[PDB]
Design a protein around this ligand. Sequence first.
Ligand SMILES: Nc1ncnc2c1ncn2[C@@H]1O[C@H](COP(=O)(O)OP(=O)(O)O)[C@@H](O)[C@H]1O
Ligand SMILES: [Mg+2]
Lengths: 80, 406
Amino acid sequence: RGPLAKIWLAAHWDKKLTKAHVFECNLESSVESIISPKVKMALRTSGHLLLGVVRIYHRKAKYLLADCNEAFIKIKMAFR
Amino acid sequence: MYIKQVIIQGFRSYRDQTIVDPFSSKHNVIVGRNGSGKSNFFYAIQFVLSDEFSHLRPEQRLALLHEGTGPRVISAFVEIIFDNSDNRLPIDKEEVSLRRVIGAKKDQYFLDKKMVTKNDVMNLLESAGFSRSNPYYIVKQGKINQMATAPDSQRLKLLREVAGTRVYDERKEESISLMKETEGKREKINELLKYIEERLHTLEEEKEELAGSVNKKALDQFVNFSEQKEKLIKRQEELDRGYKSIMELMNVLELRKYEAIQLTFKQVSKNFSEVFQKLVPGGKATLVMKKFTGVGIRVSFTGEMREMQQLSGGQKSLVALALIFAIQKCDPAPFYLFDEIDQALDAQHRKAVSDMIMELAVHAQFITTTFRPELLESADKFYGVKFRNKVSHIDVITAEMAKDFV
Ligand SMILES: Nc1ncnc2c1ncn2[C@@H]1O[C@H](COP(=O)(O)OP(=O)(O)O)[C@@H](O)[C@H]1O
Ligand SMILES: [Mg+2]
C-alpha cells in the first residue's frame, strides 16, 4: 500500500487497474516520488516502476483516444 | 504471505493424493530416509513457483508424472495455497489457491480455480516480490557448490543481474516500445481535436447566420460539444505534461544507474561479513573486485585470509552459503525452501546455521529437509516422508520421532 504501490501493480498486474485508477493517477507527482524516494532504491525496482508509469501513461492515452473518437463521430452524427 | 498448505497428486513419487498438513508460518522441517520423497516434494513446489519449471518440453513434462505399479498415471497437479493475510499478493482474499495441473497435452495453471497463463503466474509472483533475477528463494546443494566453485567473473555477472542491470535494461527497453506506440495515438488524438475544433467553428458560423436572419441537433448541442472539447483538452494536457516527466525519469535512471549498481554491491559485502562473522564467531571475511571484471572472496576464520580457491572442503561450501544468506538479507522474501543445505559442513557449523535460522524464521517461513539433527533444533513443525510400495507419504510427526530418522 501507498503512493507508488499503484505504479507497482501497473508494471506487474494491471488487473487491479480500473479506468478510474488510470484516470486518478498523477504521473508527474509519481515520477517525483520515484526520483526523490524515501530510501534509495535498487536499480531493479527503479526499472519496474519506470515501466508501471509508462503503462498508466499508455492507458491514459488509449482511453483519451477512444473518447476523442466517440466525441468526433458524435458530432458529424448530429449534423444530420 | 506464506505457504499455508500444499496438495500433490500424481507428481513423481506421490501417486495418490497428498494433503500435506498445513505448514507452520515459521520453520517446518521434513525428515525421511534417502529416496523417500524429500527432493521430490520440493520439486512439486518448485513445479508451481519456480521460473526454471515454467517452460517444459513435453519430455520434461512427462518426467513429472508417476511411473509405478498401478494403473498408468495420467495427470498430476500441485495446488499451493498461500495465506495472503497481509495482502502481499494483489488479490483480495485471505487465502490464494495457485495450482498447476499437468498431462500428456495439458499444462494449465489455476488461480482461485480460474484459468490463468504461465505469464500471469510469473507476473503475479514477480508482483509479490519474487524476482526471477534471484535464484536463491530455493536453495539446493547444487546451487551451493555452483556458487563455491565459481569464477570471480561469473560471480560478477550474478550480482549485476541481481542488482538490476538485466531487468533494468529489460524494462527500460520495454518501456520505449510503449512510448513509440503511444505517439501514434497522441497524434491521432491531436488530429481529432483539430477536426472537432473545425466543426465547432462551422457551427459557430451557422449559429450566427440564423441569429442574424446542418441539423438542429448539432445547433441544439453546440454548447455541450464546446464544453466537451475543453474536457478532452485538459486530458491531452495531462499527457503532454506526463510525457515530459517520463523523459525526466528515464534520464535520472540512466544516471543513478551505476550509483545504484555499486549501491547494491556495497550492501551485499556489508551483509556478507555480518553473516559470516556471526556463524563463525571470531572469523572475518569480505568481498573484493578484480580488474570491472570479477568479484572474489577473502576469508579469515580468526587476519590471515586466503583466496576462494585456496580453501578447504566444508569450508568453501559454508563460505558460499554465507554469500547466499547475505544476498538474501539484501532482498528478502516471505518464505524459503532449503533442500539439504547443511550436508557439506561439519556439525559445529551445522549448528551455527541452525542457530541463525531460529532468528530468521521469526520473520519468514522456511521449509527445509535434512539428515543431521542440528537443524531440528531450529524447527517448529516436523514432517516425516515415508516410501512404501513405490509411493511416498508425508505425515506430521513429533520432534522426538524426528530425532529418529536422522
Ligand atoms: N517420475 C517419478 N515417478 C515415480 N517415482 C519417481 C519419479 N522420479 C523419481 N522417483 C522416485 O522416487 C524417489 C525419489 O525420491 P527423492 O525425493 O528424489 O529422494 P530423497 O527422498 O532422498 O530426497 C526415488 O525412488 C526416485 O527414483
Ligand atoms: Mg533428495
